Symmetry: C3
């Protein structure tokens, strides 16, 4: 199924008929970072399998729902169960849910992920406000926009220089300062490793040379689809480890360690994103 | 349809039957840089849709013709409407028209494109004679030659060290000197960004570190197919902007700005390529 | 055909029924480096075309057999005819034979390849014990593990920090010292160029900047599948040329030159790998 105007329209029509919510904010949350979704008020849960044209997710399994409702007095739509390109989903499957958000009225998209630290200032449990990216898939002919352009959504050749909104980064930092956790908050450049293997020790060393601050396996595809259709983005990485220190000390990384860092920071991140939503212009 | 010997032969047979021209030079022109094609003498226009085994181009639309005739006393074939990999065309679709040129008798291929400047010496409106490349798709398993080798055209493992003919570069520069525009002409290394998003500010900074002079979304696939089958190549980039300066000043780039630079340099480039064709050994 | 537990099991069942050998060591040999396979004792040759679910290899042609038997008193299985990703084989086709090795009982995989030298210490005819890698396909969304995870074989997110076993590297070097050829043996980082074009001169210069010691078109996919399912790996490159020196002197490389270096070192490499097999813990 192509992520075109007609197919996105049919999905949006279904959602409007069952939910009654017209959202202007969308959220996509990293693994272990989804508690805010469970606290959406007056919520409507819409399984992906019930939505016309949504991608089939039964091979990977686990949860896959759109959740609409209110947070901090604002109307939101959340993806509960994220689609990642290392799972084998196509460009069209990743793009369709973001283009549905656009047709529903979304103007701002808030994203979190788990990532490895490259910059030597970064420690496990730190946050990074993403200010730019290095898209290895895109340089290598696997950009999320390879294919015919869908002209109703945006231009053939997008400019990404303002993909990460500067005022949203400033608001996130201001809230951290108000609650005395600004010592955990950095800014940086995100390298997209297609995955699903963690970056090797020698890949980490290369990324240091190339000016990358953090590395992960998500986020950039959704940012590009959002920027193409005019949705503003804030993206925040939670640092699971420093891959450069681990390489120098011969220390390993695993998904269990990543999820334990997520559990340690989950409540703080939930409160931070609730306040960002409340305060958005 | 595979870009094999039998399929290329059937296309070549059709073209010979309708055009009567046996070309020894081929041309592929960048967007806004195609006026020379309209001035081919005693011309025969052959739509792609009429040629056996040529790729289907109706989803993208717009023009798609082969044009044969004479320029400066030499017999040429031009592609009018270029196939780009960011549109979703396969390796086989890109390769077939170049292999048809080979079977028609083409010995030299002349190429122009629009590109972004990385080297700090480069300004909008400058030209770059390409002397080498960094092929991010090829390093990343998206080389145009991935697939079975077509042995009638060339070897399993080509060497690209002489892909950009040195004497053709020297002739192009000599003509610029004769007409007092050599101050616009540089040489450099071309980075292939698969596209269709412009290189991000942080990607531009990375390319500076890695020794790239210019960046664009075309040219390298055709160069590789030509080199594989023994066709000599001259490739020239027209610089639309300096991406490093734009990153330092927070200035944007768009396709409209690119096309306006093309219009400013179109007549000079047309005259330059007509004289190169006339003077080729 | 997916490289899943049921499909690998059916292939393993066939092999057990015809061969009677339960191997604990697997070998994959580079082009021109396969003489050791012909000297396996009490050998059973099983063509790929006869094994349920093995990939079809008739388009490329040439040899394709599994060979089981004894070397130096140990039970081994060899791939005779290697599957390379530049030929167009999918992730699933590359992975299935390694996962069959796992189900047959393989605990150690020994690999050789031909490569180009980047580090200035490396000369034609030298050997490099691989200690890490830079996987350009994997960074660019063409990792061999892209797709659903096969949970019976390994985790969704593997760590590659110990993919190249340190004690196997030490044993290989010790044997070289015992036979007075340690002056030919180096260690280094392997860059995976998807291929099939040799790295361009400007690509070689980039790899020097990024800390790569050698470059080739194989090995990394098999290493990743082996590491995912818990098989230890030793990987050795034979250096065909120094690509940096060749770029500085404008000297070409071709497959004929590569095969002549292979012939010069074939007997030494055969004897070295026979002794490694004999001495493995
Ligand atoms: N303290 C503020 C509200 O702050 C919400 C918040 C708590 C913890 C982290 C970020 C925001 C008043 O009350
Ligand atoms: N001036 C030369 C012919 O030069 C053709 C040319 C004009 C402008 C740019 C490049 C070549 C004589 O007459
Ligand atoms: N020389 C040892 C056995 O060495 C086998 C070997 C020969 C050449 C290269 C590597 C190992 C005793 O006899």
């Amino acid at each position: 199924v192509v992520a075109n105007y007609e197919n996105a329209s049919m999905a949006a029509d279904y959602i409007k008929r069952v939910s009654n919510v017209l959202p202007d904010i969308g959220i996509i949350c990293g693994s272990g970072l989804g508690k805010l979704i469970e606290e959406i008020e007056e919520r409507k849960v819409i399984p992906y399998i019930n939505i016309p044209n949504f991608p089939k997710t039964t091979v990977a399994g686990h949860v896959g729902n759109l959740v609409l409702g209110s947070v901090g007095g604002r109307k939101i739509v959340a993806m509960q169960g994220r689609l990642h390109m290392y799972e084998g989903y196509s460009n069209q499957e990743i793009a369709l849910p973001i283009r549905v958000m656009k047709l529903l009225g979304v103007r701002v998209l808030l994203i979190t992920n788990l990532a490895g630290g490259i910059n030597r200032k970064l420690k496990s449990g730190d946050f990074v406000l993403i200010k730019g990216h290095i898209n290895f898939p895109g340089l290598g002919l696997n950009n999320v926009l390879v294919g015919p352009n869908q002209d109703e959504f945006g231009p053939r050749f997008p400019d990404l220089s303002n993909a990460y909104d500067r005022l949203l980064q400033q608001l996130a930092l201001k809230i951290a300062q108000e609650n005395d956790f600004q010592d955990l908050v950095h800014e940086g450049v995100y390298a997209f490793n297609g995955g699903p293997t963690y970056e090797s020790p020698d890949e980490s060393n290369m990324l240091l040379k190339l000016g990358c601050d953090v590395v992960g396996m998500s986020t950039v595809p959704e940012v590009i689809i959002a920027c193409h259709c005019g949705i503003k983005v804030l993206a925040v990485s939670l640092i699971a480890n420093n891959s450069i220190l681990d390489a120098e000390n011969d220390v390993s990384i695993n998904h269990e360690k990543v999820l334990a860092v997520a559990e340690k920071r989950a409540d703080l991140l939930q409160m931070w994103f609730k306040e960002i939503i409340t305060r958005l212009p």
